[PDB]
Amino acid sequence: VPRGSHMTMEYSLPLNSCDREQILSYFEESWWKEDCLFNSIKKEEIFYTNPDPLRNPLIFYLGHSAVFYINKMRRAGMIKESINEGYEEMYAVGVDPIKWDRVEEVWDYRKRAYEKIREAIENTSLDLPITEENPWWSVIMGIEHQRIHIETSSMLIRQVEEKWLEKPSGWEYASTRGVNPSQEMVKVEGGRVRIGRDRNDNYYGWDVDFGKKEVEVKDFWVSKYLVTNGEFLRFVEEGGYENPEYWHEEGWIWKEENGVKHPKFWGKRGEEGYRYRLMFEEVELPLDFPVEVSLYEAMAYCRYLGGRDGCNYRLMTEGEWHLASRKEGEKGEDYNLNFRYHSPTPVGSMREARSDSGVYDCRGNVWEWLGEKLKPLEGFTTHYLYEDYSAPFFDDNHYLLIGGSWASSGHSASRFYRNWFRPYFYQHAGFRLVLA
């Protein structure tokens, strides 16, 4: 199925038809969005904190997106000179488990990098289509990487104390609409599903997005909504976090070692109702928003709900999501993707985010966990610009996450972007139920 079609809508650049100005605007929108995100931090020294203890300090990510562009475009030949070789080494490699520069210095690197990148986009000969061997792939890779980091850095900043932050002007949250709408299982017809793209696809992809796997999917029942905060509140209030029947050993230990008694972005003080941390402020828990959980917590809720309902629940496979999410004639405006809002939306409230099987928010709103591990597909090959993008993580310890959140833009909002995280890592991410 070609990408960019009525049922494969993409938010990224059509690489067989994008003019220079389209590339420049796509680059600028990404860079300016990242600037805006980092400018939300109103105390300079917060850049030296690592608000997510599993990731580097904010200052690293401030330099990282800029250095990545320079490194890849130099390797592709689009740029000749380095700006700062020391920076281009120190800020090049991220972490998945020094002496930092001053914030002003890193902003200064960004400004110099931005100027050099823009000039290369303005002046370099452009021959369409942009394919993997075309030097321009480094520009597209650089933009798509920055777009991923806007989202991943947003999750870091969400973990910074709100007293050091101010929401950027123009960024708006979605409002709650009230109580969670009633959950319902709906039937998705099975079929033989293709996973993976063929190369020279007219759209960007990462190495792990390309390949061929065909899976026979049986008819299945899936919850039409992502599991909501209101649904999950029943799990919390009924002792789900204290009941070992709902947890396997690995998740129980995680839960105990991290003192977890509720989802990460819920908060409670005394007997007051739960609060909920948006990007930059706390509100009363929005019962109709999708709950944002680790994979462990999603599985624990599945076990709890199966006990209550007298059945078994599990998460979708990758093939199941493609079937559940299929929507002919889909449009970019249908989904809570690409900063349509700067928060999750009430489940179902994006009324055109209903798949052809009646499943809501399969694309957008919050990532959804899958029950399957990151694996390469038949035909997997690395790209010469970035050997270690996915291969280090084929350890059967990373789970797939799919469909994008409100914060996913560009190729990260694609149906065909194959995303992954450790089961204890937090993202703007939820889940739905499958009858097992």
Q: What is the contact surface with Na ion in residues (CB under 5 A)?
A: 361, 368, 403
**Cβ distance to ligand AVJ smaller for residue 94 or 358:** 94
Contact positions with ligand AVJ (CB under 6 A) in 361-390: 389
Interaction of residue 392 with Fe ion, rule CB under 5 A: no
Copy the structure tokens of residue 384.
Answer: 């010469």
Q: Which amino acid is at 130?
A: I
Task: For residue 428, say whether it is annotated as part of any ligand binding site.
Answer: no
Closest CA to 383 of 70, 75, 121, 122: 75
Using CB under 6 A as the binding rule, whether residue 408 contacts ligand AVJ is answered as no
DSSP for 358-369 reads S-B-SSSSSEEE
Question: For residue 135, what are its two tokens?
Answer: 């030097």
CB of 145 to Fe ion, least distance (A): 6
Q: Is 94 in the site for ligand AVJ (CB under 6 A)?
A: yes
Residue 392 binds ligand AVJ, judged by CB under 6 A: no
Choose the contact partner of 419 out of ligand AVJ, Na ion, Fe ion, none; CB within 5 to 8 A by kind. ligand AVJ
Interacting partner of 232 out of Na ion, ligand AVJ, Fe ion, none (Cβ under 5 to 8 A depending on kind):
none
Q: From the list Fe ion, Na ion, ligand AVJ, none, pick the one residue 44 interacts with, judged by a Cβ distance below 5 to 8 Å according to partner type.
A: none
Instruction: Say which entry of Na ion, Fe ion, ligand AVJ, none residue 101 contacts (CB below 5 to 8 A, set by partner kind).
Output: none
DSSP 407: T
Map tokens 């709890």 to a residue: 304
* Residue whose C-alpha is closest to residue 209's, from 398, 94, 404, 374: 374
| 239 sits near ligand AVJ (criterion: CB under 6 A) | no
Cβ 123 to ligand AVJ shortest distance, Å? 27
Nearer to Fe ion, 1 or 93 (CB): 93
User: Which of residues 49, 71, 138, 152 is near ligand AVJ by CB under 6 A?
Assistant: 152
* Non-local CB neighbours of 19 within 8 Å, separated by 6+ positions: 126
Kindly tell me which of 152 and 294 has the beta carbon lying closer to ligand AVJ.
Answer: 152
Which residue among 296, 304, 420, 426 contacts ligand AVJ (CB under 6 A)? 420
Shortest gap between Cβ of 148 and ligand AVJ (angstroms)?
Answer: 5
**64 labelled as ligand-binding?**
yes
Helix, strand, coil percentages (3-state) for the chain, rounded to 5, are 35, 15, 50
Angle between helices 295-309 and 249-257 (to 10 degrees): 120
Work out the burial of residue 236: count CB atoms within 10 Å of its CB; fewer than 13 is exposed, 13-18 middle, 19 or more buried: buried
Q: Which stretch binds ligand AVJ (CB under 6 A): 76-84, 117-125, 145-153, 341-349?
A: 145-153
Task: State the Cα torsion 16-20-24-26 to the nearest 10°.
Answer: -20
- Dihedral, CA of residue 194, residue 407, residue 46 and residue 389, to nearest 10: 20
- Residue 82: what are its φ and ψ, rounded to 5°? -80, 155
Tell whether residue 383 is among the known ligand binding residues: no
Contacts (CB under 5 A) with Fe ion, residues 81-140: 94
Q: CB 63 → Fe ion: shortest distance, Å? A: 11
Helix/strand/coil (H/E/C) assignment for every residue in 168-223: CCCCCCCCCCCCCCCCCEEEECCEEEEECECCCCCCCCCHHHECEEEEEECCEEEE
Chain residues in the site for ligand AVJ (CB under 6 A): 94, 96, 145, 148, 152, 389, 419-421
Residues at the binding site for Fe(3+) are 64, 145, 149
Residues at the binding site are 64, 145, 149
